[PDB]
Amino acid sequence: MKKVVAVVKLQLPAGKATPAPPVGPALGQHGANIMEFVKAFNAATANMGDAIVPVEITIYADRSFTFVTKTPPASYLIRKAAGLEKGAHKPGREKVGRITWEQVLEIAKQKMPDLNTTDLEAAARMIAGSARSMGVEVVGAPEVKDA
Template sequence: MAPKKKIASIIKLQIQAGQATPAPPVGPALGAAGVNMMEFVKAYNDATADQRGNIIPVEITVYEDRSFTFITKTPPAAELIKKAAGLQKGSSTPHTDKVGKITQA
């Protein structure tokens, strides 16, 4: 069995699916860890191409040799609710102004 790689850092980001670029917030977070940004961007966009339009949380594990692996998670519930209600953003005054309604059906 091969020896385990030592983890240097774990980076958590929320990025648009299929639309990651080396610009902020991706670039600075990965650059500080020494990860090849273009390699990550290409791999992330390929992995999330079928979920385009959603914000997908990703957990990037960076190893001491600057290699990385990543795990994509499910979209945040708040994003799914806004999408179901057809909203761009939530209420500016929560619990006071209601901006949308969704039903179970």
């Protein structure tokens, strides 16, 4: 028996949101907890840095708020998929932010069931690209030329 009851989707300031977001009251729809929401948020936006994040607080009947969001969109999962971990005491040698075709694809497929896109090449570039702009770079995608 699955049937989400409430889901708050909006954009909150990373490393700046406070227990008084543009929703607040419109958010307390699971148990009435604004801090826990921003508390954890700030935690993520506090460990990474400042920015904006499209929250997707999915409040399930069982007062369950499921939503993974921290750095800008694409980063939502391209980060861990790329390598944006922490400053690291030693230089990350490789270029910070590196994903692979297979990664951007699997990351796009679910992000392109058939909305505006359709084929993978399209979404694929949308992802491998989104990262490209995010300073990230495609590690896989073996430049296939004379093959």
